[PDB]
């Protein structure tokens, strides 16, 4: 039932609005990706609002969770689109913006694109299902909290524990303890990739005018809040299995 709701509330795919007549410089590609992320963030907010249990959390906590997890949610969904639409041969940012080796280099994000692509390759290896994917994406929204905890920490933990229980019930469909630990390992591995993506994001945000990289209002707001918190060590990534 909660998983059935997850399958039905999955946002529709959105276009990048990519102009292939313009030169494929890093500034043009990154500006297009940033505009696409802004549009996708509006969808994340609308999805989170109807996520079973999310409305029980206070408003300040809902905002904190979305601001800390945005990069993780966007990179996980990118890997799902890449896996579903290309069998993870390309980075499927949108139907009108599919990255091959050429675009990975032109974006000036080559190694970070390889890192995101490795998640897409893990989806092929595991033969990740849509049911597993939707629960795991909810767990990513609930994977980073403030160092001093949320306003309603107990309410958050109840919601998180319940989605971990849904993931454990779902793996039985594909012995199943082995699969559960392969999925929690994959969830944990998102923290390291996101840390690297955020380092690059923050750099382009601080030097936006110089690099000619544009940011939509939704990203300006999220990054302006997130950047000082992440850099000052206020973020607490939650791991299933500590390093």
């Amino acid at each position: 039932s909660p998983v059935m709701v997850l399958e039905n509330i999955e946002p529709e795919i959105v276009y990048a609005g990519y102009d292939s007549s313009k030169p494929d410089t890093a500034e043009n590609l990154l500006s297009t990706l940033n505009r696409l992320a802004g549009k996708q963030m509006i969808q994340v907010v609308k999805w989170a609002k109807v996520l079973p249990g999310f409305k029980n959390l206070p408003l300040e906590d809902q905002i904190t969770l979305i601001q800390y997890s945005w990069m993780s949610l966007l990179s996980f969904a990118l890997s799902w689109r890449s896996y579903k639409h290309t069998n993870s041969q390309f980075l499927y940012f949108a139907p009108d913006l599919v990255f091959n080796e050429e675009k990975m280099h032109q974006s000036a994000m080559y190694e970070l694109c390889q890192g995101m692509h490795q998640i897409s390759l893990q989806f092929v290896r595991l033969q990740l299902t849509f049911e597993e994917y939707t629960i795991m994406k909810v767990l990513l929204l609930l994977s980073t909290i403030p160092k001093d905890g949320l306003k309603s920490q107990a309410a958050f933990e109840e919601m998180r524990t319940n989605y971990i229980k849904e993931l454990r019930k779902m793996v039985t469909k594909s012995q199943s303890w082995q699969r559960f630990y392969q999925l929690t390992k994959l969830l944990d591995s998102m923290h390291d990739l996101v840390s690297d993506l955020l380092e690059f994001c923050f750099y382009t945000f601080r030097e936006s005018h110089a690099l000619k990289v544009e940011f939509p209002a939704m990203l300006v707001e999220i990054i302006s809040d997130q950047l000082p918190k992440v850099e000052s060590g206020n973020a607490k990534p939650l791991y299933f299995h500590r390093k």
């Binding site: 609002k49 408003l59 905002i63 707001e221």
Partner: peptide
């Protein structure tokens, strides 16, 4: 209100 506040409370 911020953009996230507006979107979450609408």
């Amino acid at each position: 209100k911020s953009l996230l506040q507006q979107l979450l409370t609408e």
